[PDB]
Design a protein around this ligand. Structure first.
Ligand SMILES: C[S@@+](CC[C@H](N)C(=O)[O-])C[C@H]1O[C@@H](n2cnc3c(N)ncnc32)[C@H](O)[C@@H]1O
Ligand SMILES: C[S@@+](CC[C@H](N)C(=O)[O-])C[C@H]1O[C@@H](n2cnc3c(N)ncnc32)[C@H](O)[C@@H]1O
Ligand SMILES: C[S@@+](CC[C@H](N)C(=O)[O-])C[C@H]1O[C@@H](n2cnc3c(N)ncnc32)[C@H](O)[C@@H]1O
Ligand SMILES: C[S@@+](CC[C@H](N)C(=O)[O-])C[C@H]1O[C@@H](n2cnc3c(N)ncnc32)[C@H](O)[C@@H]1O
Ligand SMILES: C[S@@+](CC[C@H](N)C(=O)[O-])C[C@H]1O[C@@H](n2cnc3c(N)ncnc32)[C@H](O)[C@@H]1O
Ligand SMILES: C[S@@+](CC[C@H](N)C(=O)[O-])C[C@H]1O[C@@H](n2cnc3c(N)ncnc32)[C@H](O)[C@@H]1O
Ligand SMILES: [Cl-]
Ligand SMILES: [Cl-]
Ligand SMILES: [Cl-]
Lengths: 375, 373, 375
């Protein structure tokens, strides 16, 4: 059919790529709790019966990577004998470190080159694309019910996908799709009814229609799951972690990385700018691209896109942003308290628009400055 | 000439690194849970350490931290090895055989044969060859750590040959190989080793004119797991009697006392040592054989190598009357659930007058003398 | 008061023996491609991991995965049962310069150490009866497992044979076997098969058939192989040699090229001892040889005939010195060790193998020993 049907996904806490992101970030959190000058780039692979914990860490901390891994996998139903754990923790290259640690100048140089995008829109109270919001809410509710035993005979590996029709000014849900790992002895009629009710409850929470197509466990059988069914790796859900394919992406993964890795810290910074632009009613949608060079303390380029939804001249938005924000890396890392933020909570259900958390980059504390500086 | 030879290896020898990590892990399990079942095996090669085996316990052991405790005093750091942790549980089929329904019994954790040995050559009741080989390396490693012997590393081996042709033993050869720094001074090194060798000979009142073989390869800069792969249980002759005693093939390190390879070997040593200390024989070797799940040995043989000072049958009888052969009972008699095993993972499990081991105590001499009437 | 001596064996599916077989299969492949290979291959097999490690310098290429599958497939495993880790380091150049003398007609010993060779006149193999019987039991069971004459068993197994030497005719005191069996086995059939095999082996050696039989004493052995117990190369050195009747110097054989004197000098010492006994110079003979790394001959030797010498001990010692060449390169060549296949000795012992044709088992030095013992 000829329609503007846009679709986003989410994955659950027992999805194998997400297991890896959680182990990465739990390891990071333990390092930063002990040593706020740590350099951490922790990458995890989970396949069949092997978890590999790798990457580059220089720190005065000590993290028990096995115990950390068990903290992620035990609430999903795994035990201490399910995986071989390989710890292959190298140090940070001293050639990278000397570029980042500009001790001479009181600066932080970017930890790599790269491009990041921040995005926000006015479709939801979270300032996020509705497709992404709904996809995450479905899986958060299913996992909440799995743990409380309100939804029985399911497991933690799951995925969702939500399609919205934006052909006219009011969004309508077109399709909600979920796949949930289930026990062998499940009752498919009970399962279908539980999923259908969750789907309707999420639609009603956002005041949307309830007569959309429902695709429920389309494979027809999902008993094998987690890393047994599919290999996970850190940073393989970067679109689920961000804006569901509505926002552009520069390719950088977040989990496992300390704030000197601009892939993470500048992504958060760009979100904070974009969200405040939209909350200030300067635009309905805003995307901020920032580019970096390794060792340089400021971005090498910036572009601001308001998708023709700017309410004032784009040059005044651009100017207001430059006057309201500090683009020095060390400074924005400190402005967002990134050394003392806990990252494990954002390793599932997305890093942005988390009205269930209290993230620095989600604060609307720049609206007044943007309004004043746009005049 | 009658020339007998034994060896030892140092704390940085790669097989011994593995034995030490195995026993360190075991000691941590038993400190938390005295009913742990542990069979921890370790491999160290180039830049990989693999920690494996079968553990069922209430304890939690940080295997990485434990491994670092062994390798850091040898000069390694946290980025030298990838560590693989592959801890499986104990087979429930083995467990039901060991943990009897009758809760007063422990079944043997496997079949097997063990040998215990003792002789009257040293105050340790050990072969002189083995005693000297270990003492050389203990002194070198002591000096490495105190910095009295500089520009050496922890991987080392020794080998001592004794001439037993006459009634006084004579040292024939002492051999040492010690990993050394690239910028070492070979003259200083040779002089230090020569003096250590003489100091050990003098400590045992022996001759000091023996052949000395010092770093025969001519260069030993590459060492530890980089130079040679280590595995747990690959130094079982060094761990025991230096080739003078027989061996049944079972390794010690990493095993809880329900593994009779370990606990019955200790028990057999305790018997043999007390037999010799009681002056029933000059040398005594005790063989015990086991069957998995059975609480007592299925066979025993006592060999005194024609050095018995009383009838062999009376020794055999005195042993049967003086010791309890029930596994659970001898484990408890030797306090094996609360003994620390790390200290015996280097420099041998027997004749350690530097330690205080239950199986080395001469507390059965009076019983053996009384029961040999 | 009975004199009861006991020795053991293990089967081809015993996890330590799996490791010895993979080690020697890798060695055999290296030597088939490059007769100057230096090989020290060590293997670990746990739960679901096989690690192939050690030090190899060669022009050969060995597919270690394919080689491991060649050992494990006839035992019932498949390509998805194990993760395989290949960690092949090169031989230390510091060892190599000591072994490979500039004088190209010499080989220096690959290490220090002590080895023992042993032989006795109890069996046609010139081996302890206890060891011979223990191996024969498991060879026959494994033969029947493969031909399907003995059903519902698996390849992990052990034996232990106790002989009563109190009288001039040996008596079997106990035969013990443990065999991994299927869940749905019939214990009555299983006990009858094992009992018959035990009797058949006794009758083959003209021994009594009324001995104690200990058959699967654990009462259940369904879990086995590396799942039930961790294997490592070189952890059955007494099973590989003389069953605890002969002394041992601690060196393992499997995975090692002939420049490793732990292997080649052990074979040489066996060859000497066996020929001494076959020449009727003694009923039992044990030869100890000691080495120093880089030196082309032994640094010590001791000959023990256990008071069974039929001529003066000094003449035995002299006859040995006159009949054998103790230069390492020379005895390696005399035993054709560069072209012998080692896989066949990785199960059921390296000595007294009347089922194989090994150079170190040949009685081709009897004539020299007799001649050189007279004057
Ligand atoms: C264990 S950390 C801290 C040790 C000591 N506390 C200090 O301040 O030096 C030292 C180095 O270990 C390496 N490493 C290996 N495994 C590690 C882990 N599990 N936790 C932290 N560092 C690890 C990192 O490269 C790190 O820089
Ligand atoms: C379908 S798998 C990916 C392809 C897979 N690696 C293969 O070898 O074909 C990706 C994700 O889908 C989910 N999945 C796994 N098995 C599934 C099934 N049987 N039905 C539905 N979804 C499943 C899990 O979340 C898994 O991470
Ligand atoms: C961690 S332990 C103890 C858990 C808990 N305290 C209890 O009593 O149940 C549980 C199982 O973890 C397995 N395991 C895996 N890695 C381990 C490790 N590093 N330390 C101890 N047990 C380990 C052993 O199989 C053990 O029986
Ligand atoms: C000689 S190496 C063993 C053979 C070795 N795996 C190979 O690839 O030839 C065994 C031991 O001797 C010692 N070693 C290593 N390099 C040596 C050298 N260059 N000189 C003398 N001894 C050495 C170490 O203690 C090591 O564990
Ligand atoms: C692959 S081999 C031979 C390559 C080439 N044919 C030649 O003669 O140089 C070269 C080195 O690779 C290493 N290597 C790593 N894995 C190996 C393997 N699987 N088989 C053989 N050598 C291996 C050994 O250290 C060996 O000395
Ligand atoms: C008993 S296991 C060794 C100790 C063991 N690793 C543990 O965790 O207790 C040693 C060998 O005995 C045999 N074995 C394994 N399970 C057995 C069973 N249930 N009954 C009898 N023998 C078994 C296998 O050959 C295995 O290699
Ligand atoms: Cl996926
Ligand atoms: Cl060695
Ligand atoms: Cl075993």
């Amino acid at each position: 059919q000829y329609k503007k049907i846009i679709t986003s996904e989410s994955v659950g806490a027992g999805h194998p790529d997400k297991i890896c992101d959680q182990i990465s970030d739990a390891i990071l959190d333990e390092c930063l709790s002990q040593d706020q000058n740590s350099r951490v780039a922790c990458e995890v692979l989970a396949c069949n019966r092997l978890i590999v914990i790798a990457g580059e860490i220089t720190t005065h901390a000590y993290v028990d990577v096995v115990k950390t891994a068990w903290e992620i996998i035990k609430p999903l139903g795994y035990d201490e004998n399910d995986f071989t754990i390989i710890s292959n923790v190298n140090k940070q290259s001293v050639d990278i470190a000397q570029s980042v640690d500009k001790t001479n100048k009181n600066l932080i140089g970017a930890g790599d080159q790269g491009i990041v995008f921040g995005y926000a829109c006015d479709e939801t109270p979270q300032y996020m694309p509705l497709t992404s919001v709904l996809a995450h809410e479905l899986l958060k509710e299913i996992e909440r019910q799995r743990r409380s035993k309100e939804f029985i005979k399911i497991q933690a590996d799951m995925k969702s996908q939500v399609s919205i029709d934006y052909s006219n000014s009011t969004p309508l849900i077109e399709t909600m799709l979920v796949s949930i790992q289930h026990d062998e002895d499940y009752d498919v009629e009970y399962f279908n009814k539980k999923v259908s009710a969750i789907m309707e409850q999420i639609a009603k929470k956002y005041n949307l229609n309830t007569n959309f197509k429902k695709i429920i466990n389309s494979s027809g059988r999902f008993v094998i799951g987690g890393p047994i069914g599919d290999t996970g790796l850190t940073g393989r859900k970067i679109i689920v972690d961000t804006y569901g394919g509505v926002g552009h992406h520069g390719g950088g993964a977040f989990s496992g990385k300390d704030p000197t890795k601009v892939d993470r810290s500048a992504s958060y910074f760009a979100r904070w700018i974009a969200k405040n632009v939209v909350a200030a009613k300067l635009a309905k949608q805003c995307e901020i691209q920032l580019a970096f060079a390794i060792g340089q303390p400021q971005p090498v380029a910036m572009y601001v896109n308001t998708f023709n939804t700017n309410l004032i001249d784009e040059t005044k938005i651009f100017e207001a942003i430059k006057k309201s924000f500090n683009f020095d890396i060390k400074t924005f890392i400190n402005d967002l308290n990134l050394w003392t933020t806990k990252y494990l909570p954002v390793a599932t259900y997305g890093h942005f628009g988390r009205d269930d958390l209290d993230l620095s980059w989600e604060k609307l504390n720049k609206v007044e400055d943007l309004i004043k500086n746009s005049k």
